């Protein structure tokens, strides 16, 4: 009779009756907050851990489970295989048949009446005796550990070994896994033996168990289930994991029957009982009950976080919002395949669809009325799609409809169907030039930069004067600049006209004098930092000619001049030996250039002059100088209670941020100055010093009398 996969008895004392037939408990066992005589000689094995907590009335564990032999501890409770905590009225661990605890350690705590703790040699019952925890029980000095047998060495002492006041601690002879009285068990056996050295006469099997036999490895057509027995192929085809929306059966992998495929594996199609090795990052397919997922806010897109394939339809309708381009890109940036259609309707905040990066496949299981797989409509600020010449896309079935997108150039969507593969699939009214590209400036002039001047925090940059195409147009300029670590920078990185995600914008007017060209002075920049700068022209045309031109400049990458680096961060020092000092630190906050080396300095500090004057035979304290259970109760409470719904010496460190100083006066204080230079520190000068004080190790045996 197997019972599981988890027994949790609490509150009612009579609820303990659920163990009347169980001989093996598959999983853990909880006897918590219990407030007569119940005996369960049937139980012998517990696969996982055993937990006891605040059971009133129970005096000994032998009253309940006298035949408990093996606690395998396949899964542990905070690395413990047996927890006896806050057990009142409990006097002894009456598990006089306990023989082997396979994995975890023991934590016996806060049992004011518990005796027979030191009388148990836990070194022959479990292995990790060093990581046990027996604190807060009845003190052995104030108990009376008396036996009514054998004995061995416990720690440095040799004393008798007994479980309770009537039963001793049973042990096997040195010749052997033994029976009741001196006859060795089978090698594959564990604990006791109904008959000597027989597979079908074992209280508990080591390794694995099948058809009444203690087998080392499972038979060919059986697989590992839990950690003690073997089951066949049809058994794990009937198991079902914890109920969820994506809850499925158990898998067979590596001869084991687990709940889900391990890391780096995914379930095979059709044959869904085995795991196939996916080489890349295996996908996280997201399945939602609603047919068309509507993304009308950043909070609604949260459910699509980390999804790779989306089984459904996407409806994007983002009117208002926060910083959206960087936010949706966190959730929807990993989506690669959309099984249905994608509709971007009324998304006025979106100036670009770049947040759908890895999206490389749109199928067409369900299409909007008229067989449409890509449908955008009324996007007053959509300047560009996510279709630039870098990304890939494939719409398997369906058409594309574009209407009332004024800032979107009609040439951009013609370039889309080239990669999309639907060139002649749409109709003549699906892509119209009337309400699309109405306010868009496709073909634009080129603003040419003229000169750039760079300091450590200021940049002067000027571009050529721009005469507008019409005489009447009022002309102004706008400078877009932002810190770019490297060059892959696109002009579209914000949202709407409020997307302050990246580009800093400054409006400079055309100078009155025609001999001076327009420029801008940037102030407050990080030294040695590459900035992406480009200028756009503001052509306010009095004659609203729909042949919109405009002017835009090339992305210019400008890096400021290097400066004095910052001080090294977090200087720590220690002394592993006399005449030696080890020091470690972190790179500076603002390196302001390429780091070349560090310059460390150490100066001898004088001994305190005030120390030499006083008579220390009168002072009581002489000055000395130096060199160089709650967390478990929180875990137990968070799991149980579930609510119902001198000159300076100078050296240079070439590469690392660590160094060891040699040849020092033992037990002498030292000032440790550390500087940080860069490639331009030969002219600018190395940085300042972040200093620390450390004393060396005392010379051992040097402060004693050197003669008779």
């Amino acid at each position: 009779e197997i019972c599981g996969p988890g027994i949790d008895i609490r509150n009612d004392y009579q609820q303990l009756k659920r163990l009347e037939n169980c001989t093996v408990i598959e999983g853990y066992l909880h006897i918590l907050l219990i407030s007569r005589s119940y005996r369960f000689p049937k139980l012998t094995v517990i696969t996982e851990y055993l937990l006891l907590f605040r059971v009133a009335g129970l005096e000994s564990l032998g009253d309940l489970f006298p035949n408990l032999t093996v606690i395998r501890g396949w899964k542990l409770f905070y690395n413990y295989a047996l927890v006896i905590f806050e057990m009142t009225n409990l006097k002894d661990i009456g598990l006089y048949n306990l023989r082997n605890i396979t994995r975890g350690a023991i934590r016996i705590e806060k049992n004011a009446d518990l005796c027979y703790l030191s009388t148990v040699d836990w070194s022959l019952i479990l292995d990790a005796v060093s990581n046990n925890y027996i604190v807060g029980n009845k003190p052995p000095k104030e108990c009376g550990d008396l036996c009514p047998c054998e004995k061995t060495t416990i720690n440095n002492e040799y004393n008798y070994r007994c479980w309770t006041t009537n039963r001793c601690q049973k042990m096997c002879p040195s010749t052997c896994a033994c029976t009741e009285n001196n006859e060795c068990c089978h090698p594959e056996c564990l604990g006791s033996c109904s008959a000597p050295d027989n597979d079908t006469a074992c209280v508990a099997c080591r390794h694995y168990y099948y058809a009444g036999v203690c087998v080392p490895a499972c038979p060919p057509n059986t697989y590992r289930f839990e950690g003690w027995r073997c089951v066949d192929r049809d058994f794990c085809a009937n198991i079902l994991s914890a109920e969820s929306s994506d809850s499925e059966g158990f898998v067979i992998h590596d001869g084991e029957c687990m709940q889900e495929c391990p890391s780096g594996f995914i379930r095979n199609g059709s044959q869904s009982m085995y795991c196939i090795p996916c080489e890349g990052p295996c996908p996280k397919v997201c399945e939602e009950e609603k047919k068309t997922k509507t993304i009308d806010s950043v909070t609604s897109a949260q459910m699509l976080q980390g999804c790779t394939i989306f089984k459904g339809n996407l409806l994007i309708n983002i009117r208002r919002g926060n910083n959206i381009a960087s936010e949706l890109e966190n959730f929807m940036g990993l989506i690669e395949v959309v099984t249905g259609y994608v509709k971007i309707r009324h998304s006025h905040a979106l100036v670009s669809l770049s947040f759908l990066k890895n999206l490389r496949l749109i199928l067409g299981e369900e299409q909007l009325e008229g067989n449409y797989s890509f449908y955008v409509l009324d996007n007053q600020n959509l300047q560009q799609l996510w279709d630039w010449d870098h990304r890939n896309l494939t719409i398997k079935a369906g058409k594309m409809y574009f209407a009332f997108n004024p800032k979107l150039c009609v040439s951009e969507i013609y370039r889309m169907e080239e990669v999309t593969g639907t060139k002649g699939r749409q109709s003549k009214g699906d892509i119209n030039t009337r309400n699309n590209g109405e306010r868009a400036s496709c073909e634009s002039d080129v603003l040419h930069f003229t000169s750039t001047t760079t300091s450590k925090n200021r940049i002067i940059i000027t571009w050529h004067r721009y005469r507008p195409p019409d005489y009447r147009d009022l002309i102004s300029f706008t400078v877009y600049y932002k810190e770019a670590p490297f060059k892959n920078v696109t002009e579209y990185d914000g949202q709407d006209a409020c997307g302050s995600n990246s580009w800093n914008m400054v409006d400079v007017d055309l100078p009155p004098n025609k001999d001076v060209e327009p420029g801008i002075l940037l102030h407050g920049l990080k030294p040695w930092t590459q900035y992406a700068v480009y200028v756009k022209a503001v052509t306010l045309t009095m004659v609203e000619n729909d042949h919109i031109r405009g002017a835009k400049s090339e992305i210019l990458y400008i890096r400021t001049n290097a400066s004095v680096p910052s001080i090294p961060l977090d200087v720590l020092s220690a002394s592993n030996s006399s005449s030696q000092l080890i020091v470690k630190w972190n790179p500076p906050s603002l390196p302001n250039g390429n780091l070349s080396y560090y310059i460390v300095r150490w100066q001898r500090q004088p001994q305190d002059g005030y120390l030499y004057r006083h008579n220390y035979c009168s002072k009581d304290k002489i000055p000395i100088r130096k060199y160089a259970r709650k967390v478990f109760e929180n875990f137990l409470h968070n799991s149980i209670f579930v609510p119902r719904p001198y000159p300076f010496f100078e050296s240079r460190v070439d590469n690392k941020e660590r160094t060891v100083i040699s040849n020092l006066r033992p037990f002498t204080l030292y000032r440790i100055d550390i500087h940080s230079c860069n490639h331009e520190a030969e002219k600018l000068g190395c940085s300042a010093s972040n200093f620390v004080f450390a004393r060396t190790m005392p010379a051992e045996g040097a402060d004693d009398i050197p003669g008779p």
Partner: antibody
Framework: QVQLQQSGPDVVRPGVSVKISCKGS????????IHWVKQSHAKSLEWIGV????????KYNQKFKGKAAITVDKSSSTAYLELARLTSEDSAIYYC???????????WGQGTSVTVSS | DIVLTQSPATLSVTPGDSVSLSCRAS??????LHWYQQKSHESPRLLIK???QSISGIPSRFSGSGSGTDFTLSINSVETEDFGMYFC?????????FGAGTKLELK
């Protein structure tokens, strides 16, 4: 000697709840999952959920999640199919299927006729 | 979901003839199609597991075939006992879906 015995026919008024028993015999009741199938008419066979007798977990059909509720009784070797807020559309013959796995339904119960009368 | 469409709605057959039933699926399913026989006033009984392999108990007259989106059930020697409704069950993905039913009536 495998056999599944379901409850008798039921006739109840709309808006009430009902459950259907299904006792197993001739096989290890804990080793096989139990399916439930709805047959409103001879044409439509609708799978509505599975329960795993080992751990007690379930997996429902989306069209019956807010309607059905499958439970099990390990000691009594009996599964139950609860149906609340019954309407005239739920008047069907429900079947108990097991002795297979989450994929095939080898053996079926004799069926339970549920009739929703005005 | 996934829908199963069985081609012959009703088949008027006389005993001794050879008939073949069809059951096509929307999505592609390598096997995971299971046939069920249900006579009048009874409960459906499994006939063929995973499109092809048979069950111990059903006569050798029944035989399944097909792979992917096309599947076949063939009664080589139709007998007086084989007259009744037939179904195909889909089991590759969730949820499990059945066919519309093919009635094998007497001609």
């Amino acid at each position: 000697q495998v056999q599944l015995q379901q409850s008798g026919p039921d006739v109840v008024r709309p808006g009430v709840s009902v459950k259907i028993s299904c006792k197993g015999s001739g096989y290890t009741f804990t080793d096989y999952a139990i399916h439930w199938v709805k047959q409103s008419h001879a044409k439509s066979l609708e799978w509505i959920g599975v329960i795993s007798t080992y751990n007690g977990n379930t997996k429902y059909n989306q069209k019956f999640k807010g309607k059905a509720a499958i439970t099990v009784d390990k000691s009594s070797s009996t599964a139950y199919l609860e149906l609340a807020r019954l309407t005239s559309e739920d008047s069907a013959i429900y079947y108990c299927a097991s002795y297979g796995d989450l994929y095939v339904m080898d053996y079926w119960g004799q069926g339970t006729s549920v009739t929703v009368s005005s | 979901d996934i829908v199963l469409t069985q081609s012959p709605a009703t088949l008027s057959v006389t005993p001794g003839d050879s008939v073949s039933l069809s059951c096509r699926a929307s999505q592609t399913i390598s096997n995971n199609l299971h046939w069920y026989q249900q006579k009048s006033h009874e409960s459906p009984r499994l006939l063929i597991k995973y499109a092809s392999q048979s069950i111990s108990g059903i006569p050798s007259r029944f035989s399944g075939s097909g792979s992917g989106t096309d599947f076949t059930l063939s009664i080589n020697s139709v007998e007086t006992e084989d007259f009744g409704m037939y179904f195909c069950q889909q089991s590759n993905s969730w949820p499990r879906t059945f066919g519309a039913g093919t009635k094998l009536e007497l001609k």
